[PDB]
Design a protein around this ligand. Structure first.
Ligand SMILES: [Cl-]
Ligand SMILES: [Cl-]
Ligand SMILES: [Zn+2]
Ligand SMILES: [Zn+2]
Ligand SMILES: [Zn+2]
Ligand SMILES: [Zn+2]
Lengths: 369, 369
C-alpha cells in the first residue's frame, strides 16, 4: 500500500464514502476511530472485531506515562499495545489545556496533573513525540479556542495555529522516516466566524496537508451551532482530502456531520458511556442500571450483531454494572463500540447506494421516537 | 453422562488423578476451580480457554444481588452468566460469618454488608438457594470454626456441623430435580484435632455424600499446620470419592495438598492477585508494578502458554496496572488463571506417569530458588 491515498467511491450531496490506504491498512470512510488509550477495557483483537479500521492514541496520556522515549525503546505504540493497523495520534494540545495545570509563541510549558512534573510541548516536540510513538496519522499542534470566544481572541489563536501548522509541517518533513511512512493532518480553527474559518482554510491549503480536521467544535456550542459552522466550514477545505471532525460525538451528531461532508470521527462517548451504564441502541440510548432492566432477558439492542448481544441479557449486564464488576464495563464497551461501527457501516452503505438521506431520516425517527 | 461418577485413573502414594463425570461435563482431577463471581474480569469463553472444567459461584454474593429467586426466573446461573459447564456453589456460610454483620441451632440470621437488609440462612434455605441457582455441585451448610479454637468449641461446632450436614442431605434429597441432576458434598470439621476429625469423617460417611471437603483450613494456621492436619485427615475420608480442600490456595500449597490426597481446589488468589499486580511464574510470583519491569520486553512467564504471554510484554502490563487501566486486570487475571490450569495439568500428567514426586521437588526448587 502507499503512504497515503484517499479515494472517494460514491457521493450523495455533501456526503462521501470511500477509503484511505496506508501502509498498515485500509480505512473505510466515513470512519469512527475508537480511542485506544484514555475506560480501556478491550483487547485490540476485540476492537478490530467490532469493525474498527483505525484507533486513536492520546499523546498527552502517553508522554506522561510510560513516556514517548520509552515507547520508542520498547518498539513503538503498535508493538506495545498489540494493534498493527493504523493509529492516529492527537497532538496533546487539547489535554494540556484541560487536564494539565504557561503559553508562548514557542509553545506551552505545563505541570503533569499526576506528579506535578514539568514538560514543554511545542509544534516540533509534539511532532517528535508522535514520531517516537510510531503514529500513522499525525495531527499538527495548535492552540485551542474556548467557547465562547471573541472575534479578536479567535483571530489571534487561529493565526498562531496557522503559524504552528507551518512549523508542524516542516518538523514532520525534516524527519525522513516520518515523512515517508506517516501522514499529517492540518486543523482548521476560527471558532464560529466564517471569515476566520476561510483564512484558516486558505492558510492550511497553502501549506498543504494529507487531511484537514475541523477543530474547535463539540466544545459546548450545541448541535445547531455546530451544524451551522460545519455548513460553511467544510466546503472551504479541499474536497479531495479527508475531513476529520475532532471529538464528535453522539450518533445523531455523526449522521449530521457526514451530511455536511465529514469523513472521520472520534469520541470518548462509547467507552466512557460504557462504564456509566449507558448503552446505545437504534431506539435511543438506555441506562442499563435502571431498575426496569433487572429481569429483562433481551440483548442490549434487538438488531445489534455484536458478540455481547448474541450472548448476554440486559438483566445480566444490569447486574454486572450495578455490582461494580469489571466484566460489566467490558461488555458495555464492546457493545457500544460495535454499535458505532454498525452505524458507520450503514452510513457507508447508504451513501454507496444513494439512499443516505432516507437513512438519516429513518435513523432519527426511530432513534428519537 | 451420569449425574455424578468419580473415577480414579492413576495413583502415586496418596496422590490421585482421574475424572468426575456430570451431566454438564467432565472435570479433570486434581482440579482448580476459578471463582466465577467475587475481580470479575473474564468472559466465560476466556475462562474455559485457560482450561477450567468447572467454576465456583459464591452463594452469599448471589443471594444478595441479584437474588436467588431472580436468578431462577432468569433461567438459572449457567444461563445468566453464559457458562454451560459444571458449577460448584458454596453454601454461603463462610461469607455470612466474615462479610456480614445471630446464630442458632436453626441457622443464622444476618444483615447485608450492603444495604443492611435482613436474611436467614439455614441448611434448608442454603440448599434451596443453590437449587434456585442451578448449581451442579452443592455444598452442605455448616458452622465455621475460627482459628485458633479450643477443643470444646471445635467439638461443638463440628457436632452442629454434622447435624446440619444431615439436614442438608435430607433437604437436597427431598427435591427431585436437584437430587437427580446435582451432587452434594459433605464438609469435614474438627479444627486441628485428630479425634474430632475422625468423628466428623465417620459422621459424614454415615450420612453419605458424593464428595468430601476438608473444611477449616487456610484460615491462618500456616502451611506446616495445614499439611499436618491433612496428613491424618484425608485418609479418614472415603477413598473412592473426591476430596476438596476449600480456599486453597498458593501453588506450593496445592502441590502439597495433592501429595496428601486432595482432588479439588478453589482460591481467590489468582483473580485477586491479578488486580494487585501479582503474576505467578514458574520462578515464583512477581509484582509487575515493580520499576524493574518498566522496560522488560519478556512475557509474564517464559514458558506459559496463555494468550497473554504470547502477545504482551511485562513492560506493557506494568504500564496498564500502574495506570489503573482495566485491560491490565483483564490480562493479569487471564494469565494467573491460565498458570493455575497449567499447574494442575502438570500435576495430572506427572501422577499419570508416576513421576509426581519428582515433579513436586523440581517445582519447589525452581519456584523458590
Ligand atoms: Cl495506553
Ligand atoms: Cl456474579
Ligand atoms: Zn495507558
Ligand atoms: Zn450489541
Ligand atoms: Zn455478581
Ligand atoms: Zn501467561
Amino acid at each position: 500500500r502507499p503512504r497515503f491515498s484517499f479515494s472517494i467511491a460514491a457521493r450523495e450531496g455533501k456526503a462521501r464514502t470511500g477509503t484511505i490506504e496506508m501502509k498498515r491498512g485500509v480505512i473505510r470512510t466515513p470512519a469512527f476511530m475508537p480511542v485506544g488509550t484514555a475506560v480501556k477495557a478491550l483487547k485490540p483483537e476485540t476492537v478490530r472485531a467490532t469493525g474498527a479500521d483505525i484507533i486513536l492514541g492520546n499523546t498527552y496520556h502517553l508522554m506522561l506515562r510510560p513516556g514517548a522515549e520509552r515507547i520508542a525503546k520498547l518498539g513503538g505504540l503498535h508493538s506495545c499495545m498489540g494493534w498493527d493497523r493504523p493509529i492516529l495520534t492527537d497532538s496533546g494540545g487539547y489535554q494540556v489545556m484541560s487536564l494539565s495545570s504557561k503559553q508562548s509563541e514557542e509553545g506551552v510549558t505545563f505541570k503533569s496533573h499526576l506528579d506535578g512534573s514539568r514538560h514543554m510541548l511545542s509544534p516540533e516536540r509534539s511532532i517528535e513525540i508522535q514520531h517516537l510513538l510510531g503514529s500513522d496519522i499525525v495531527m499538527a499542534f495548535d492552540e485551542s479556542t474556548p467557547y465562547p470566544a471573541t472575534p479578536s481572541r479567535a483571530a489571534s489563536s487561529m493565526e498562531r495555529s496557522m503559524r504552528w501548522a507551518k512549523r508542524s509541517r516542516d518538523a514532520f518533513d525534516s524527519r525522513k522516516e516520518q515523512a515517508e511512512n506517516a501522514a499529517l493532518f492540518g486543523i482548521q480553527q476560527g471558532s464560529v466566524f466564517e471569515n476566520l474559518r476561510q483564512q484558516s482554510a486558505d492558510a492550511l491549503a497553502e501549506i498543504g496537508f494529507d487531511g484537514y480536521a475541523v477543530g474547535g467544535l463539540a466544545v459546548g456550542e450545541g448541535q445547531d451551532e455546530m451544524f451551522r459552522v460545519l455548513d460553511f466550514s467544510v466546503p472551504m477545505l479541499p474536497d479531495d482530502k479527508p475531513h476529520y471532525l475532532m471529538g464528535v460525538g453522539k450518533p445523531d451528531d455523526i449522521v449530521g456531520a457526514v451530511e455536511r461532508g465529514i469523513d472521520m470521527f472520534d469520541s470518548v462517548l462509547p467507552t466512557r458511556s460504557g462504564r456509566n451504564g449507558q448503552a446505545f441502541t437504534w431506539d435511543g440510548p438506555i441506562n442499563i442500571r435502571n431498575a426496569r432492566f433487572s429481569e429483562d432477558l433481551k440483548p442490549l439492542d434487538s438488531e445489534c450483531h455484536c458478540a455481547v448481544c448474541q450472548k448476554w441479557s440486559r438483566a445480566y449486564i444490569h447486574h454486572l454494572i450495578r455490582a461494580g464488576e469489571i466484566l460489566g464495563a467490558m461488555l458495555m464497551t464492546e457493545h457500544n463500540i460495535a454499535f458505532y461501527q454498525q452505524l458507520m457501516q450503514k452510513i457507508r452503505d447508504s451513501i454507496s447506494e444513494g439512499r443516505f438521506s432516507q437513512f438519516a431520516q429513518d435513523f432519527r425517527a426511530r432513534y428519537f421516537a
